[PDB]
């Protein structure tokens, strides 16, 4: 998971 | 190819003339590489994951080949456990989830 | 069913009555869920990604219905940003990557  | 998930999805990318294994990662918005020498300027980006937030360095229009496929995107350089190949370049190389 | 990565890949999951949604994520080995309480005993574990490690409670053989289809396996319950559907149940519902 990797957001923004 | 067709990649199953019983093994971790590592693939050879080839950035700046060196081979590296990166992970095909759908949970990820961006492509996050481990510390390396990208060409030109950078800007700062906040990016959170599971442990929370981190500051990265962002490089625009980087040419990374992936399983002998060329993308030209935004690469983030930072402290990742592993080299992440995210949605930004997965759409570029025409990657889909199939079930 | 081809899923595109134009947008973050979010599916409905039905868990303990509930309809929740999770992210189909080829970067995650295991499945992490929002803090909740599963039946049975758990083994504490530390999973870490970007921004480091967090402390989850492992529960073995939990039934998830991932967008209609069932899958048994280990489920981690911890302080996650988003429910994550990892590689563990993904193969179970015969998910794959293509390009
Ligand atoms: C940053 C990452 C891309 S790598 C790391 C992975 N952790 C897990 O699956 C633990 C986990 C489980 C469920 C949900 C979140 C995390 C690990 O340590 N991988 C070693 C490794 C990686 C590639 C090649 C070889 C070895 N987490 C990923 C992520 O944050 O989603």
- Name the residue range of residue B78's domain: 1-99
Q: In 10 A of CB B93, how many CB atoms? A: 18
| CA dist., res. C61 & res. B16, Å (int) | 44
| CA dist., res. B80 & res. B23, Å (int) | 11
| CA dist., res. C3 & res. B74, Å (int) | 23
| CA dist., res. B44 & res. B28, Å (int) | 18
Q: What are phi and psi of C50, to 5 degrees?
A: -80, 120
Q: In 10 A of CB C72, how many CB atoms? A: 13
User: What is the total count of domains within chain C?
Assistant: 1
How many angstroms separate the most distant Cα atoms in chain B? 41
By alpha-carbon position, which residue is closest to atom 1 of ligand 1?
Answer: C49
Resolution for this PDB entry, in angstroms: 2.8
In the stretch 50-79 of chain B, residues with CB closer than 8 A to chain A read 50
Burial class (CB in 10 A: 0-12, 13-18, 19+), B31: buried
* B60 a catalytic residue: no
**Which CATH number do you get for residue B5?**
2.40.70.10
Find the angle CA(C84)-CA(C18)-CA(C65) to the nearest 5 degrees. Answer: 60
The residues facing B28 across adjacent strands are A2
Contact call for residues C91 and B9 (beta carbons, < 8 A): no
């Amino acid at each position: 998971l990797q957001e923004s | 190819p067709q990649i199953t998930l019983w093994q971790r999805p590592l693939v050879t990318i080839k950035i700046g003339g060196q081979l590296k294994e990166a992970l095909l990662d759908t949970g990820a918005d961006d492509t996050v590489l481990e510390e390396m020498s990208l060409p030109g300027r950078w800007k700062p980006k906040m990016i959170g994951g599971i442990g929370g937030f981190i500051k990265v360095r962002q490089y625009d229009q980087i040419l990374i080949e992936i399983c002998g496929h060329k993308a030209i995107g935004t690469v983030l350089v930072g402290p990742t456990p592993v080299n992440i190949i995210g949605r930004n370049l997965l759409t570029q190389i025409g990657c889909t989830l199939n079930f």
